Design a protein around this ligand. Structure first.
Ligand SMILES: NC(=O)C1=CN([C@@H]2O[C@H](COP(=O)(O)OP(=O)(O)OC[C@H]3O[C@@H](n4cnc5c(N)ncnc54)[C@H](OP(=O)(O)O)[C@@H]3O)[C@@H](O)[C@H]2O)C=CC1
Ligand SMILES: NC(=O)C1=CN([C@@H]2O[C@H](COP(=O)(O)OP(=O)(O)OC[C@H]3O[C@@H](n4cnc5c(N)ncnc54)[C@H](OP(=O)(O)O)[C@@H]3O)[C@@H](O)[C@H]2O)C=CC1
Ligand SMILES: CN(Cc1cnc2nc(N)nc(N)c2n1)c1ccc(C(=O)N[C@@H](CCC(=O)O)C(=O)O)cc1
Ligand SMILES: CN(Cc1cnc2nc(N)nc(N)c2n1)c1ccc(C(=O)N[C@@H](CCC(=O)O)C(=O)O)cc1
Ligand SMILES: CN(Cc1cnc2nc(N)nc(N)c2n1)c1ccc(C(=O)N[C@@H](CCC(=O)O)C(=O)O)cc1
Ligand SMILES: O=c1ccn([C@H]2C[C@H](O)[C@@H](COP(=O)(O)O)O2)c(=O)[nH]1
Ligand SMILES: O=c1ccn([C@H]2C[C@H](O)[C@@H](COP(=O)(O)O)O2)c(=O)[nH]1
Lengths: 547, 546
């Protein structure tokens, strides 16, 4: 137990990194990893100018002290140095160039002991209440003589590089700023053997970018109230049924994380839950599943666009499918001719005849979503008919209610037409959307009866999130929450091995969705009115790994 | 440093109490309280004979030690006793009758320091593995001498009586056995202002009764933890309507550490909406606090989730259910049974305000019963014969459960978009979806609009009862009822009444018994339904208005 210097003196690094203009040239087949986030500085300032939320984070972490924990720290440091026996503050250590780019208004940093590394400048060159050191050794000496809680290295690139190479960083509080800026200085490549990610925060939006916060940890290389807890768990299981058939040593990364606050973990945990506690069942398909019943996921669309990052999704298909719904189309050829094959297997001669739809033309999918959204209750004829002002246009009705009766508890769009189910290639998986309006903000609940977690759910989160934006925009509202309720939630046995890979990937900060803001009517959107920005993602996974 | 002997020596009572037969006595509008549960013994044995879960709990609590936590408890007991001096075990103190009540198979109680209070007997009638004592003071002595983790008073009635009388009990680990037996000995009345409940477990079934486990407390008179603070850096100074609702009004709710009783799923949502709800106006000028999207789950295999923090009546809601199953839309059928759930929605004025100018009073239009038995049929009037018109979705979901239990399309849907404008009211209960695994039926009901103070308590009961009915006619056991709330709201006029309700500690849930001979969904009648062992707090008038 030859105690480490960074452990005795609680020396941490905190930084913010953006993505870099591109030294590889263009983004077609873009590879991503931790090192995508490495931009620290440009021309002596920040690459992004201002990030209000990162600065709030920076201030809270570097200012926070827990006075009741100091005693254990003082003792520990005393022993290490061989030693005996008014507001506690953290130390912040910065390079001279970093000190100089802090605005005057903010220097020295409030409620913190400020330490500047310089050779060119000495105490006489500073007016301010700061300690000047001319080498790293002088920090260890200084920390031996101060009362302080923790010590934060706050940059810049030269200072980070020398604290990391000297093995003096216990943890890295790392902000991922999910946008690209011109940068002339970079955080050092973090060695994956020296440091592991132990925590990932929620995703936020600030100054027109998404960001999250992650923590890297240096790799190894009253009392009767806790008794009451134990008592109330007397009737628990020694084992989970498929725990012995899905070995959690296959989830080394997923289980190594302490805080899993990134909203992608809502999806990934449900997979975990189904893998460990799911019911082995047959299904319509013959494939066989693990299943569970009843889950709820919430995504904050004001803060991010929840496109899964732990594998590659493409949105052109599901944006085209959604536009096809809104037009009220049931013609499978329209999608096929845009090279969207979502519905191809469900429109075949064989699939239709197995549904007893012997009088249905190939790719005529019958009165599915689009027909129900624009014409609920009309008699379906064929995919070419003009159902002009036939049946209930519930899409137009919900837009009307959101504009004119926003507190209505009756703003629902329902695809589950009980009369029409046997005429549909497939009864709807997405039963209903309900809308909620508070203070100029639109939330949406979608109830999904049947949830393919490997293949379907990722696309479905994106569809209904995109659809919430479209409806919010034409009603003059801001999008708030997309809330996804899972009925029969299943993992197909043929997805297990690929979902196991996916679960050991750490999510990236989400992207953002921009809509052309001239679109004033739900019918007026086309594919080029939609931009996904700053999609950072792990490699595409084939769910079916057959060959 | 003010320290009492019950805290010094960590002397706990542990007991199991049932309810008591009143051999030709009271029972009118029954008043319940904690003293409802006081049955300890009959003819020197347990009133209920056998309860394997209570015995499993007794064994776990009385057998459990944290050795790591002892140092601090040896320190404390030495300071007190003016002193400072193999494997750690708890003490169990019982009366001689209680000792003799135990079967020889199991005495002496495995891995415990057994102690017996006895005026009659002495060490020579027993052995040296067990200890005898002659009075209560002789235990304070023997505790002072021993290496023991905690000291457990395991009865009987006389032991508990004097141990409480003298105030030597720090905490009471009290099993509530929610059935009635013949009793000849009782636990003593526990005084409110002397002992308070601090924890309430999940409700369970064992040996054909519900039970739960509550904990009474005596009333008075290292670094990864920072990472947690950092992740909360963007949080609020307060919760939105905090100034407005005042959490000091929730002292009992907030004083509890473990709130595992499933009734807390309902009470926690009321607390969530009061603290964090959005102020809105509705179809009227009436105030609500509203939030969007909640799930509750009730284990129908372990209990019937009839709220306990206030009094609920089910005759009306069971009749409404039978009325739905018959396909009826005739509101007069219910009014003639004094079920007035739909009365306000049937009046001339209400139908005229819905634009239903050509609808007969109490002709509720193509609501639930019509959609359940006849989805897609043209509604005419409430008197028409619709036989074999529309989709009988009720019949269909039952055949699906029986023939294709792994179908993901077992769905009963009342939201008929084409018919909404013809209904007195569009359905609040949009759909039921069913799920079958290993001979067990679960049901999700999605509710678009949830009156939490008045509606949701009945709605939990309706759909739990319907789950039992569907399960029984399909030869399945009910598993979970899962309630999804869309627009969840508390009416402002309910807030004072819900504040009272949140401060009441739930009782163990009742059970539902169906007549087991009914194997067709259409053949249930009101006499087929029995709620058993309903223990509840006083009725609450949700709207206090005089
Ligand atoms: N995004 C983020 O988290 C952060 C961004 N930044 C950005 O990074 C840039 C600044 O980084 P960079 O240019 O690397 O400069 P630094 O802030 O790392 O400062 C470098 C200078 O620090 C002094 N110094 C460093 N190490 C020592 C040592 N061991 N002994 C003595 N003096 C030492 C020397 O100053 P001297 O020359 O006077 O001797 C050296 O020239 C700016 O663009 C800034 O905005 C800054 C910090 C954090
Ligand atoms: N449900 C539950 O939680 C429990 C159930 N029970 C039930 O309760 C009944 C037993 O209770 P009960 O009949 O009241 O008997 P107890 O077990 O309380 O025994 C009372 C006897 O203990 C001895 N004793 C009591 N106080 C003293 C004292 N101060 N000093 C010395 N000796 C003392 C005497 O025995 P002696 O005459 O030998 O001197 C006295 O008659 C049974 O029916 C049993 O099944 C029992 C325990 C727990
Ligand atoms: C060294 N430096 C560059 C800089 C910028 N953002 C970062 N963000 C992170 N996460 N970590 C860093 N090390 C970091 N460093 C700084 C540091 C502080 C201030 C500054 O003015 N800080 C005020 C914040 C005032 C405010 O914006 O409210 C403070 O009191 O912390 C500016 C630049
Ligand atoms: C929304 N949707 C409908 C959907 C989803 N999951 C289903 N799952 C099952 N079992 N059956 C369905 N009919 C089904 N349908 C979609 C959306 C996208 C893709 C899709 O594009 N899949 C990728 C899969 C990529 C891969 O895993 O290699 C592809 O390239 O086709 C399929 C179905
Ligand atoms: C004193 N007594 C009556 C009795 C029964 N149930 C209770 N249950 C509770 N919750 N609390 C009590 N005080 C209590 N007391 C007892 C105590 C232990 C055993 C007994 O045989 N227990 C064995 C094992 C019994 C079993 O596993 O079935 C043990 O190891 O604790 C029987 C009666
Ligand atoms: O948008 C969609 C469409 C389908 N499914 C999945 C759920 C089931 O795996 C299958 C539909 O089959 P049934 O549930 O109808 O049997 O497709 C999705 O997850 N999302
Ligand atoms: O079974 C029922 C019927 C009604 N409501 C409540 C919800 C609303 O407060 C009101 C229905 O009116 P709208 O939400 O449709 O306006 O009654 C329930 O909670 N349960």
């Amino acid at each position: 137990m030859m105690e480490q210097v960074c452990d005795v003196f609680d020396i941490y690094a905190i930084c913010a990194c953006c993505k870099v203009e591109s030294k590889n040239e263009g983004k077609k087949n873009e590879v991503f990893n931790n090192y995508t986030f490495r931009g620290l500085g440009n021309k002596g300032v920040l690459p992004w100018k201002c990030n209000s939320l990162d600065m709030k984070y920076f201030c809270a972490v570097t200012t926070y002290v827990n006075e009741s924990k100091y005693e254990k720290l003082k003792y520990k440091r005393c022993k290490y140095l061989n030693k005996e026996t008014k507001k506690l503050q953290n130390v912040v250590v910065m390079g001279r160039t970093s000190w100089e780019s802090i605005p005057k208004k903010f220097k020295p940093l409030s409620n913190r002991i400020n330490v500047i590394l310089s050779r060119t400048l000495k105490k006489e060159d500073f007016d301010e209440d700061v300690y000047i050191i001319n080498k790293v050794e002088d920090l260890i000496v200084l920390l031996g003589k101060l009362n302080y809680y923790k010590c934060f290295i706050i940059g810049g690139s030269v200072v980070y590089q020398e604290f990391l190479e000297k093995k003096l960083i216990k943890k890295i509080y790392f902000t991922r700023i999910n946008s690209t800026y011109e940068c002339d200085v970079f955080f050092p490549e973090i060695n994956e053997n020296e440091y592991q990610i132990i925590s990932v925060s929620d995703v936020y939006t600030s100054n027109n970018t998404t960001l999250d916060f992650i923590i890297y940890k240096k790799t190894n290389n009253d009392d009767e109230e806790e008794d009451d807890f134990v008592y109330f768990n007397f009737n628990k299981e020694k084992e989970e049924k498929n725990k012995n058939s899905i070995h959690p040593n296959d989830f080394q990364i997923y289980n190594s994380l302490k805080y899993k606050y990134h909203p992608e973990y809502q999806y990934l945990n449900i997979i975990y839950d189904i893998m460990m506690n799911g019911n082995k069942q047959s299904d319509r398909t013959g494939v066989g599943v693990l299943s569970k019943f009843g889950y709820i996921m919430k995504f904050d669309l004001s803060q991010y666009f929840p496109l899964l990052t732990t594998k590659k999704l493409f949105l052109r298909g599901i944006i085209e499918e959604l536009l096809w719904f809104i037009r009220g189309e049931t013609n499978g050829n329209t999608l096929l001719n845009k090279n969207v094959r979502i519905w191809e297997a469900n429109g075949t001669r064989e699939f239709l005849d197995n549904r007893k739809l012997f009088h249905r033309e190939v790719n005529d999918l019958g009165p599915i979503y689009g027909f129900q959204w624009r014409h609920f209750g009309a008699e379906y004829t064929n995919m070419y008919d003009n159902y002009e002002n036939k049946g209930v246009d519930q899409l137009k009705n919900i837009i009307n209610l959101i504009k004119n009766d926003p507190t209505s508890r009756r703003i629902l769009l329902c695809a589950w037409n009980v009369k029409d189910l046997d005429q549909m290639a497939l009864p709807p998986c997405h039963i209903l959307c309900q809308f909620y309006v508070f203070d100029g903000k639109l939330s949406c609940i979608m109830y999904q009866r049947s949830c393919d977690l490997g293949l379907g759910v990722p696309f479905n989160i994106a569809s209904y999130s995109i659809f919430t934006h479209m409806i919010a925009q034409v009603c003059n509202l801001q999008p708030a929450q997309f809330i996804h309720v899972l009925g029969n939630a299943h993992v197909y046995n043929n997805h297990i091995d690929s979902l196991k890979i996916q679960l050991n990937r750490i999510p990236y900060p989400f992207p953002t969705l921009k809509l052309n803001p001239d679109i004033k009517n739900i019918e007026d959107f086309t594919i080029s009115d939609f931009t996904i920005q700053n999609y950072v993602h792990h490699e595409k996974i084939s769910m079916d790994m057959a060959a």
